[PDB]
Design a protein around this ligand. Structure first.
Ligand SMILES: CC[C@@H](C)[C@@H](NS(=O)(=O)Cc1cccc(C(=O)O)c1)C(=O)N[C@@H](CCC(=N)N)C(=O)NCc1ccc(C(=N)N)cc1
Ligand SMILES: *[C@@H]1O[C@H](CO)[C@@H](O)[C@H](O)[C@H]1O
Ligand SMILES: *[C@@H]1O[C@@H](C)[C@@H](O)[C@@H](O)[C@@H]1O
Ligand SMILES: [Ca+2]
Ligand SMILES: [Ca+2]
Ligand SMILES: [Ca+2]
Ligand SMILES: [Ca+2]
Ligand SMILES: [Ca+2]
Ligand SMILES: [Ca+2]
Ligand SMILES: [Ca+2]
Ligand SMILES: [Ca+2]
Ligand SMILES: [Ca+2]
Lengths: 254, 142, 191
């Protein structure tokens, strides 16, 4: 997170820390005691699929306390349409091997119905993005969970307000931009898979996933997030399904 | 207006443009000066656009140059107060006042719903937690 | 479908209507308005008109700067409108001379304090209630030679030649302004 502030311990209860071989890897969002939504590119170079750990109730990566809960990632489901190294369909549904305990420090974020999210939440100006990513472009990662409030933009405005880049990726209907183009605030590489939560009338909902962007907080560029509303059905059908043999699973999309 | 021989009488704004309708010329005969006459004629001949009674639903029309302005009653809006603020109970309008989910319905009124872990209260628009840790709520702040 | 274009703001005394083109053919519209940091609010749902009254929204804080956009239906096609700051841009309506009382060798010209669309406590605030000191009225009078006076209130106390007759015309003015600084001349009134 670039240009943000520490998320007071307990105020980002759905933030998930993803580890591979005990090393920091990505962020995530708990949407129920057994499932976690994250980004697909987070698994582009994974090899030890049995070494994926998800931690909840985390805050300070340098001090252990009783709010922390660890769980092996039993399954990683990525859209069959996602292409490693690319940007479209950057989403992943993780099945924890064992449900986490809901507490004052571990609570899931609501996964909204498609239309509610497109017709209402999509027009709530600000939403929170968070994670333990870089505090600066090419900089080091954070020790304490950082949070940032960013404004959402419709794609037409994003393109119009962005500077063209050498054959840069297209912003699809499966994405949306949020952030600032003045080079001051934005999410970053290590925040990948993290939540883009929208507050609406007393309840927070999952509207986006930290996915990609031109560097981090680059002048004339916005952060890009996965438009989760486009995957509601996909997520719901999968969460009611039986676990597959291996860890990695490519599920069709639509 | 001009009646037989009245023109022998000097010009009079009152008798000529107030108590009667006066032509541009009669007006120019009172003011004499061109600009003064024009400054007067712009409004005098503009005609009251509030005559159509365009402002609906008990609104109030305020005349202007080649136009009007409608002041509406609280429950109304629109150029001519034609829009009923109470006829917008559709979902795309502030989520139809629903706290969480909203579902349109042709003819009838929209209905409100809630996310799992919540229940619809009797107001038919609010949702309340039905578990200890409903999604989207922050414990150390509730 | 075709994206709306030529979005224009028609505002007088805060009565604010957004207009646009073209004449919808097999397409309806929906407008959204907001301040730079507020949420987007929808208005004039699926209308076929090429206008949308936004008065009740902008009068909530006439000093805010609003941005509006028109969605097009047969993310949807839309077009952003120019930014609009009511207080700095709403046109001043045509004033009305309320009366003039003569007292010896002087004349008191009174300018009607017209009402605006700005609601407050179940009432419509006047142009003075809203602009306060930023508003002044200039008088353009002649002995029925040009003369002019200015007042920071709604009245002019001027001198006059006994016996002779005078004609008056007034204009609302917001000096600090750059655009739409003056209203149109009021109707002419003679004592
Ligand atoms: C080529 C264009 C683009 C695909 C690429 N841009 S980048 O390289 O500038 C991202 C970046 C930014 C900063 C540092 C690094 C780095 O590799 O050190 C990389 C890019 O974004 N690549 C993807 C992964 C592609 C994959 N392997 N499937 C990526 O780095 N995503 C993480 C990320 C999250 C948020 C933001 C943000 N809000 N802004 C930026 C990046
Ligand atoms: C009353 O007169 C005005 C003049 O412009 C017109 O716009 C209205 O439609 C009519 O009712
Ligand atoms: C004009 O203003 C409108 C709002 C109503 O109050 C009318 O009664 C009045 O004449
Ligand atoms: Ca810790
Ligand atoms: Ca005559
Ligand atoms: Ca006559
Ligand atoms: Ca005459
Ligand atoms: Ca007569
Ligand atoms: Ca008379
Ligand atoms: Ca003549
Ligand atoms: Ca004559
Ligand atoms: Ca008129």
């Amino acid at each position: 997170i670039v240009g943000g502030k520490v998320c007071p311990k307990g105020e980002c209860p759905w933030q998930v820390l993803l580890l591979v071989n005990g090393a920091q890897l990505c962020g995530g969002t708990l949407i129920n005691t057994i499932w976690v939504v994250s980004a697909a590119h987070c698994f582009d170079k994974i090899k030890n699929w049995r070494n994926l750990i998800a931690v909840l109730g985390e805050h300070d990566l340098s001090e252990h306390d009783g709010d922390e809960q660890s769980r092996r990632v039993a399954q990683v489901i990525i859209p069959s349409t996602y292409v490693p190294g690319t940007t479209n369909h950057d989403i992943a549904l993780l099945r924890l091997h064992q449900p986490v305990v809901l507490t004052d420090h571990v609570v899931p974020l609501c996964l909204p119905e498609r239309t509610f999210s497109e017709r209402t939440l999509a027009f709530v100006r600000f939403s929170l993005v968070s994670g333990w990513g870089q505090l600066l472009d090419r900089g080091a990662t954070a020790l304490e969970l950082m949070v940032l409030n960013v404004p959402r933009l419709m794609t037409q405005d994003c393109l119009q307000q962005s500077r063209k880049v050498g054959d840069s990726p297209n912003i699809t209907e499966y994405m949306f931009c949020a952030g600032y183009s003045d080079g001051s605030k934005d999410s970053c590489k290590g925040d990948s898979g993290g939540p883009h939560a929208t507050h609406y009338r007393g309840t927070w909902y999952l509207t986006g996933i930290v996915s990609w962007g031109q560097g981090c907080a680059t002048v004339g560029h916005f952060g890009v997030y996965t438009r989760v509303s486009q995957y509601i059905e996909w997520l719901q059908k999968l969460m009611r399904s039986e676990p597959r043999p291996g860890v990695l699973l490519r599920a069709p999309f639509p | 207006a001009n009646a037989f021989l009245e023109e022998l009488r000097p010009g009079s704004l009152e008798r000529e443009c107030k108590e009667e309708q006066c032509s541009f010329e009669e007006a120019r005969e009172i003011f004499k000066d061109a600009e003064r006459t024009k400054l007067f004629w712009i409004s005098y001949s503009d005609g009251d656009q509030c005559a159509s009674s365009p402002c609906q639903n008990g609104g109030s029309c305020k005349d202007q140059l080649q136009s009007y302005i409608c002041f509406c009653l609280p429950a109304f809006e629109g150029r001519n107060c034609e829009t009923h603020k109470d006829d917008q109970l559709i979902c795309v309008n502030e989520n139809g006042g629903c706290e969480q989910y909203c579902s349109d319905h042709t003819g009838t009124k929209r209905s409100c719903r809630c996310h799992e872990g919540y229940s619809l209260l009797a107001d038919g628009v609010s949702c309340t937690p039905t578990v200890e840790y409903p999604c989207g709520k922050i414990p150390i702040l509730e | 479908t075709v994206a709306a274009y030529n979005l224009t703001w028609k505002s007088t005394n805060f009565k604010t209507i957004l207009e646009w083109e073209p004449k919808p053919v097999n397409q309806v519209y929906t407008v959204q308005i907001s301040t730079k940091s507020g949420d987007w609010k929808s208005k004039c749902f699926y209308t076929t008109d090429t206008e949308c009254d936004l008065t009740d929204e902008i009068v909530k804080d006439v000093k805010q700067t609003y941005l509006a956009r028109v969605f097009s239906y047969p993310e949807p096609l839309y077009e952003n409108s120019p930014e609009f700051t009511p207080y700095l841009e709403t046109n001043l309506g045509q004033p009305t001379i309320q009366s003039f009382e003569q007292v010896g060798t002087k004349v008191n010209v009174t300018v009607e304090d017209e009402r605006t669309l700005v609601r407050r406590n179940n009432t419509f605030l006047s142009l003075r209630d809203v602009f306060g000191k930023d508003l002044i009225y200039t008088l353009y009078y002649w002995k029925s030679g040009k003369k002019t006076a200015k007042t920071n209130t709604n009245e002019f106390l001027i001198d006059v030649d006994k016996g002779e007759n005078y004609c008056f015309s007034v204009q609302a003015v917001i000096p600090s302004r750059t655009v739409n600084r003056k209203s149109t001349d009021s109707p002419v009134e003679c004592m």
